[PDB]
Amino acid sequence: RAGPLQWLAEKYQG
Numbered sequence: 001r002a003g004p005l006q007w008l009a010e011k012y013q014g
């Protein structure tokens with residue numbers, strides 16, 4: 001995970 005943020009953004013929008 002070269003940027004632990006994208007997955008959180010997806011998670012929030014879900």
Ligand SMILES: *CCCCC*
Binds near residue numbers: 006009013
């Ligand atoms: C990075 C994913 C953002 C989707 C709303």
